[PDB]
């Protein structure tokens, strides 16, 4: 029900930077929560998963966590709400896997919270990208509240708040702005 091994807070600000460079990079850590639910009737939640899942050689974390979904995953009478904080949106390839779960498992829903995006001046990714998030995941941008929510729950604070870095906001603005283009249709 809980196994997350909460990080140290510089390799927090390492994997979770977001200057919105141009770059074909892959995640580390894929921190994770998983709610339940049921027909579904309104109103959340009740929480039955929380932890994380590590890229491996061959693997990229993406493929690890359906790995483990998969090895987990028991009653197809409920409806499960996933949500991911990752260093970048994902791949090409890890988006195709992805819309594949997606649509193996429809009583699945994902939310992907990145720090920030994978090369965003490519068209086939952003037309994939906006693909995605029509096929059952949400995208996101990583804000303050996701910050701090990821700070509380992932990460060995010791009591410190997250200090944002320089630029922290006008990094996060303009990858809100691209996201919301290309996610728009
Ligand atoms: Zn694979
Ligand atoms: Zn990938």
């Not at 061959?58 to 709400?81: R, T, V």
């Not at 200090?163 to 990094?171: G, Q, S, T, V």
């Amino acid at each position: 029900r809980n196994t997350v091994e909460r990080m140290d807070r510089d390799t927090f600000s390492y994997n979770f930077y977001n200057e919105p460079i141009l770059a074909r990079r892959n995640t580390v850590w894929l921190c994770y929560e998983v709610k339940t639910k049921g027909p579904s009737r309104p109103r959340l939640d009740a929480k039955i998963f929380r932890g994380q899942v590590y890229s491996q050689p061959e693997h990229h974390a993406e493929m690890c966590f359906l790995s483990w979904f998969c090895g987990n995953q028991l009653p197809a009478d409920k409806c499960f709400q996933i949500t991911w904080f990752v260093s970048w949106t994902p791949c090409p390839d890890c988006v195709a896997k992805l819309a594949e779960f997606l649509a193996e498992h429809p009583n699945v829903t994902l939310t992907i919270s990145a720090a920030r995006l994978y090369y965003y001046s490519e068209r086939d990714y952003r037309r994939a990208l906006c693909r995605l998030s029509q096929a059952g995941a949400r995208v996101k941008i990583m804000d303050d509240e996701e910050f701090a929510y990821c700070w509380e729950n992932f990460v060995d604070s010791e009591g410190q708040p997250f200090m944002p870095w320089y630029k922290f906001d006008d990094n996060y603005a303009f990858l809100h702005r691209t996201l919301k283009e290309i996610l728009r249709n």
